[PDB]
Design a protein around this ligand. Structure first.
Ligand SMILES: Nc1cccc(C(=O)O)c1C(=O)O
Ligand SMILES: Nc1cccc(C(=O)O)c1C(=O)O
Lengths: 642, 642
């Protein structure tokens, strides 16, 4: 699935910056060219209209490099004359990707910094921008954000027609684009002028350094590399998203490499005074972060993880580590931002067809593929797991469902099995399988600044990303041969997460780790300011302002939402608090609002709605001080992609 | 563009599972050819256009779905594209003869009131039958869950079809009930004569009847047919959308039929005392509708027209004509709902290529196309009209822009010209042209029940529909050889309009026609309830409820929003009234809020927003009684398509 040129924007050569559009390709041409990776059409112009199957945006040639945004192109190839053109430049952090420009492409030249600027839009509109900083400009006449959509990668031209930068995000005030965020031309020059690798453990530097370990699978990033450090006489801390992983390392490292490491998890903590410690990011945060000179090296393992505890944890490490005398911080992952799933020699990859006795995600699994052996099937949801496991056992298959809220002992270590599991499997359970069958979808949460009155956390099913595919596919072919069976090829890009997750770090700061909103912003900032980690729109000021106003929460409701393990325990207990204090009903009577069930006979009238966390079925009032406070926060500059 | 089976929903206790039988490429290629040599299975099909995805259910050898999804489109099928056997815009229902090897479901006779809705995700929602077309959902669900499920079956416990899903019944974004096309409507449509002759004017009956006149372009439905009737000693009212056409018909009867008719328009009235009157819809409304015993026949010309005035004018006739001693109502149009664009023997139709020195909508116009002769070029906006007219005048073409605002004397009646016009040309100018060049797009208005705090009227560029395309093309080829140049062959289904048009009717009722919202409801209900006219979602109770609360309007602001001639003068002036009375700024200082400028340095604080009519730049307050009122109005059943 390449990126295709489907038209171009032609700029004027004299006087005022004007532009007109030309469409060179229809839908069929596009989808065919996307498949072949082969575009024999002659490139004209500096500004390309580009399309994937799912979205359309712009691209601008500058210094012989055809430039666009990471958030639109991923690490996809460009359809070219001799075939797919690989990306010469992928920079997730600057939101910038670049292809060697093909024959007959022309470049814009870099802008004597004028402050009178001109954004070329995808409908070839030329809108005036006033330069405000290195990467910002204000829209002279503010416009709706819809006006700027699909204009990512468009040029910001100064009056000479020279390029200042390429458009990457709109800055909003309650839905109106008041400014533009761009990728400067200087960032392109830095990208093209930077000298790499990251496959080997970093040597311990003389003074504090953050370093990256992009370890291949089966190279001992969590056992061999911390052991090796400890042999050199270093004190090392290994932080992992998973209790099951953390204990398995402890057990393996006591058994094989000699050291009986200290273990720090909720369920199990042991101090041996050995130079190595395996911890979860959760236990580490519960322990109050970095302690006085205990560690020389901090291995932040699975640093690709975008759950709130890993982001908070890594954030804490980065802000605290140097001051606590660490010499080195390692950000370790097999799958960094921008990385893509490529073939594995121990893994036969087999497209699931419509022939098979088990219907699976519009295609079909044959019974004889899962008749013999131990097999893992990924499903997006609890219901589908409970359904599939029932259908399969009915056909005489030893089918077990695993998902959150269940104990792992359900999965046998021993014999024939089909485990039907959500992504919960992967932090819950350490075992491998003879084949994996992957639905290639997952559940995600997305924020919407919906202004009805405030925001919505929206739950959705999305295409899986490169990190998902590779992690799930990697549950097979470990040391031996395996099969990987799928519904769709191709992934959405890796290394990006929603502003929803930032909200979720504040929620956890507040619910679990006794962090003020201010305290969490310092940690999250450390995470965002560090390059090479997953990336997010900076909504730190926004989210801090929301959580700052949520005061005098009911302790009891919060313990309940915490224990019940659902998303946003703070935000749920907090809405419940406002409801109970007003003797008002919850937004609905979904399982989310169960803390209120005792009170149900006493609760009447419209719910004082703070935000939307699901369907609102009851009538609403927007009069409450806290609704109003959260409505006022919505005035914050919100940088959103377009 | 055919509809394409891309999958199927296999049916069993009622359970369902889905199979995907086609990808995006296959869909595009199949949609282009109309040959789908894939074997049809099941009784529920998953189907697709370029834009939409929905369901089809087979009952009585007929493969049924929604008009709002499928339009008049052929179905890709084994030996090429299957043209639709049934089209019922009023019932929202289309049928194609089921392809061989495709099972039908048997109709449900035993009126069981426990029903089961089948979604496009193969889920089986319990639904309790309420009336003929409605079932209440046993567990209210967000509207988005039901998206893509139009044409899916409502099953009784037998497994027998009750009807097909067509719409969600919403309370503030939550589907609490479903609307469906029942099985009895399918039989009625089936049992109906496939072609009924509406070519010839009907006989005047002894008792009141409403009749349809579907007569070809050229057949004098506004001259020869009123003339013929009057020759029989009948009194005829001919209603037209256009002031220019109304005057023009009176100019032609004087000549070719020896009747000097009465003429009624805003600008000009003539009373000759004749048996024929030509009036505009708006003048007919200004006059106070139907006067008793004034007319025997009312011919509502151009009755496919979905402007607010024509809809209100037609409803007024349907409600008042019988009681005013009329015996016949003729609903007259060349383009009735469901009609498809067809070859015209006078019009050479030629697609624009990318070769040509005049960029136009991504394609190009050769200068040899428009150098010499008199041509009409249709653009969606006046900005595009001005750019193009400026470009062409540079090129040595004698071009002229025409739109709302401009006087039609800009267009020379003689000599070479290129007219660059919006659809405003249609009602303002009567002449024809050597060629028409069409952008195939138009500006429309769309309601969104956005709950931020109330509703939004959104302005959007949409593909044209068969009616528009016809109307635009029909400006060439009149009694001579035309050329018709286009950007795209795409054309949306005809005979449908948006809920904002209903809003527009109440607004015109209150601003212009001295109508209470209850009076507008009577009229719009006559229009809605009459079959064979354009169709709309029934939101009369909702709009009447909002408009009813808009009491004590500032007359000075209203006269101003009227004089200014822009849309929703009543809503605009009413928002202004509240801003002024609460001594607060307008939502912005866009042209729309010009009425407030005399008061600008006295006006401070948040806007009391009632609804959104464009971008809101100022901070907002929800405290106003009127705002709280319109919010209470939003709790009404809103029937929406998903
Ligand atoms: N594939 C693995 C499974 C468990 C542990 C490790 C490790 O970090 O040693 C690995 C590996 O990546 O080598
Ligand atoms: N194309 C027309 C132009 C003017 C008048 C008439 C008419 O109704 O007589 C027509 C027509 O379509 O017949």
């Amino acid at each position: 699935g390449s990126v295709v040129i489907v038209g171009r924007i032609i700029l004027s050569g004299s006087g005022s910056i004007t532009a007109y559009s030309q469409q060179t390709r229809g839908l069929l041409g596009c989808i065919i060219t996307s498949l072949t990776g082969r575009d024999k059409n002659q490139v004209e112009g500096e500004v390309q209209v580009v399309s994937t199957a799912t979205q359309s945006f712009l691209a601008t040639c500058v210094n012989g490099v055809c430039w666009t945004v990471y958030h639109g192109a991923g690490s996809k190839t460009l359809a070219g004359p001799k075939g797919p053109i690989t990306q010469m430049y992928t920079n997730v952090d600057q939101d910038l990707v670049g292809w060697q420009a093909p024959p007959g492409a022309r470049s814009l030249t870099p802008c004597c910094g004028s402050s009178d600027l001109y954004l070329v839009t995808r409908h070839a509109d030329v809108i005036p921008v006033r330069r405000r900083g290195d990467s910002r400009g204000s829209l002279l006449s503010p416009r709706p954000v819809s006006y700027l959509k699909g204009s990512s990668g468009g040029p910001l031209l100064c009056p000479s027609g020279h390029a200042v930068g390429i458009f990457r995000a709109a800055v909003c005030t309650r839905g109106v684009a008041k400014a533009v965020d761009f990728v400067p031309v200087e960032s392109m020059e830095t990208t093209m002028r930077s000298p790499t690798d990251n496959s080997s453990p970093p040597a311990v530097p003389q003074s504090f350094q953050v370093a990256h370990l992009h370890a291949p699978t089966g190279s001992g990033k969590s056992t061999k590399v911390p052991a090796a450090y400890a042999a050199q006489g270093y004190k090392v801390l290994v932080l992992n998203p998973s209790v099951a992983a953390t204990l398995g390392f402890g057990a393996y490292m006591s058994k094989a490499h000699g050291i009986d490491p200290n273990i720090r998890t909720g369920v199990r903590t042991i101090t041996t005074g050995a130079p190595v410690t395996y911890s979860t990011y959760g236990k580490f945060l519960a322990d109050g972060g970095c302690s006085g000179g205990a560690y020389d090296i901090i291995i932040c393992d699975e640093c690709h993880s975008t759950d709130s505890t890993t982001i908070l944890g890594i954030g804490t490490v980065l802000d605290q580590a140097e001051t606590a005398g660490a010499r080195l911080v390692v950000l370790a992952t097999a799958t960094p931002p921008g990385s893509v799933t490529v073939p594995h020699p121990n893994i036969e990859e087999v497209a699931l067809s419509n022939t098979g006795e088990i219907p699976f995600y519009g295609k079909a699994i044959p019974i004889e593929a899962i008749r013999g052996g131990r097999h893992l099937i990924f499903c997006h949801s609890k219901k589908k797991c409970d359904e599939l496991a029932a259908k399969l056992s009915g056909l005489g298959i030893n089918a077990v469902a695993y998902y959150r809220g269940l104990d792992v002992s359900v999965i046998p270590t021993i014999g024939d099995v089909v485990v039907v599991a959500t992504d919960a499997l992967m932090t819950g359970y350490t075992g491998d399988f003879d084949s994996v069958i992957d639905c290639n979808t997952c559940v995600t949460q997305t924020v919407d600044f919906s202004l009805d009155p405030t925001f919505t956390i929206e739950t959705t099913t999305v295409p899986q990303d490169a990190v998902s595919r590779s992690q799930r596919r990697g549950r097979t072919g470990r040391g031996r041969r395996g099969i990987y069976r799928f519904v769709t090829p191709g992934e959405r890009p890796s290394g990006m997460f929603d502003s929803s997750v930032l909200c979720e770090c504040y929620d956890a700061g507040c619910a679990w780790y006794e962090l003020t909103p201010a305290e969490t912003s310092v940690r999250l900032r450390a995470y965002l300011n560090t390059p090479g980690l997953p990336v997010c729109q900076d909504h730190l000021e926004f989210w801090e302002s929301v959580f700052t106003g949520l005061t005098h929460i009911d302790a009891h409701f919060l313990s309940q939402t915490k224990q019940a393990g659902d998303n946003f325990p703070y935000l749920v207990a907090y809405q419940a608090t406002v409801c109970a204090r007003a003797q008002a009903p919850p937004p609905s009577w979904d399982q989310m609002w169960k803390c209120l069930i005792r009170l149900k006979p006493t609760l009447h009238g419209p719910t004082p709605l703070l935000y939307r966390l699901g369907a609102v079925q009851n009538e609403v009032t927007l009069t409450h001080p806290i609704t109003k406070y959260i409505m006022a926060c919505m005035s914050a500059d919100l940088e959103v992609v377009t």
